[PDB]
């Protein structure tokens, strides 16, 4: 349908798709947080940044977001561009400024999308020396535990719960760097599809409470396909 040029190579992709879902289908690793295949693209986390050129001869282009950019015919992009790589590392660095030192006692550990993207960008050295922001937690019922300190403000939880699942009791509160995702007050999440939040949230804010009674890491699990 459409042909795009990525990092010198040439590929055939669907024109209706955006550049993140085109390139992930070809096996090109682009980091991302706020995009979901079911939920669509909003452009919040700015992690999916690639350098886009106007044509084959344009040497200096601009950084766009691949989840928000259509894969039109004639597209010239570079994932491995140095300025794109530095910016993608910086987005992880900005998310790491307020993240708690919680991975040994986090139930998302070993199954954490934030852990995977941090390694994938190659950010391993801390420069930030100032204080971290903290949040108190809510009670969300017998199924889902709440730890707002681990939130990276990707907005996936509210987009799933209100837009997709049509739940009414989860929203975003506050402003600037004090944004809080949760309920207006403590209490059980009313939706019959609340438990998909543990897979939808890329961090360990929403985790399975029934699994945290008898916790084990993902590598120690024995799995089978079942119904």
């Amino acid at each position: 349908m459409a042909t795009i040029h990525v990092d010198g190579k040439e590929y055939e992709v669907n024109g209706a798709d955006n550049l993140l879902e085109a390139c992930l289908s070809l096996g090109l690793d682009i980091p991302y947080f706020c995009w979901h295949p079911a939920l669509g693209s909003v452009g919040a986390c700015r992690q999916c940044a690639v350098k886009q050129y106007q044509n084959a001869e344009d040497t200096r282009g601009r950084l766009v977001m691949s989840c928000m950019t259509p894969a039109s015919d004639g597209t010239f992009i570079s994932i491995d561009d140095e300025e794109a790589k530095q910016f993608r590392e910086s987005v992880v660095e900005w998310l790491m400024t307020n993240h708690p030192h919680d991975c040994p006692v986090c139930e998302e550990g070993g199954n954490c999308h934030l852990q995977d993207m941090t390694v994938m960008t190659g950010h391993s050295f801390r420069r930030y020396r100032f204080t971290k922001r903290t949040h108190r937690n809510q009670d969300l019922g017998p199924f889902i535990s709440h730890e707002m300190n681990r939130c990276i403000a990707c907005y996936r939880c509210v987009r799933y719960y209100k837009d997709y699942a049509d739940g009414t009791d989860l929203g975003v509160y506050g402003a600037h760097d004090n944004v809080y995702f949760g309920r207006p007050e403590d209490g059980t999440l009313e939706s019959e599809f609340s438990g998909n939040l543990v897979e939808i949230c890329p961090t360990g804010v929403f985790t399975d409470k029934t699994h945290s009674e008898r916790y084990n890491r993902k590598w120690d699990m024995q799995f089978a396909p079942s119904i």
Partner: protein, 156 residues
């Protein structure tokens, strides 16, 4: 034990006529309730939500987002002093220091009797006319630290 009063309720439904959606009246509904009571209490979030026909998490999201809508109890008179860049050049820090001596509080805190609450605010749009502050709906310009006690006396 919050109940929407019969005049607050009529004021909210008056402004639902001026929009396609009743969701658009949510900001004014919060200001209507706050004008009568000083601040928006916790039971007013569900009260406004059921009148407008939108969920309470949407109402609470709006109220926490907007700075002037208050979700904590304030004093009888709110003092809002400008701390932006043009007021910084004209000497707001001397006004802030004079406000912290007459009231013996810090910004974000109310007075012990509850007469005044002290809050910083953005640029009031009166930049050419000096350091600026607001007490309720009244704007005072050309502020000096000596003028601070006499100005406060008017608001009892």
């Amino acid at each position: 034990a919050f109940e929407l009063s019969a005049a607050e309720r009529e004021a909210i439904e008056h402004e639902m006529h001026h929009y396609e959606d009743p969701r658009a009246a949510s900001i004014e509904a919060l200001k209507i309730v706050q004008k009568q009571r000083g601040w928006v209490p916790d039971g007013a979030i569900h009260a406004i939500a059921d009148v407008l026909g939108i969920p309470a998490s949407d109402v609470e999201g709006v109220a926490t987002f907007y700075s002037q809508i208050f979700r904590q109890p304030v004093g009888r008179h709110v003092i809002r002093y400008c701390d932006s860049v043009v007021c910084h050049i004209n000497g707001y820090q001397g006004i802030q220091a004079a406000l912290e001596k007459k009231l013996n509080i810090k910004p974000g805190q109310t007075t012990f009797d509850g007469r005044f609450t002290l809050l910083p605010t953005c640029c009031l749009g009166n930049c050419d006319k000096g350091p600026n502050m607001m007490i309720d709906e009244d704007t005072h310009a050309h502020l000096t630290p000596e003028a601070i006690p006499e100005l406060l006396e008017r608001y009892k």
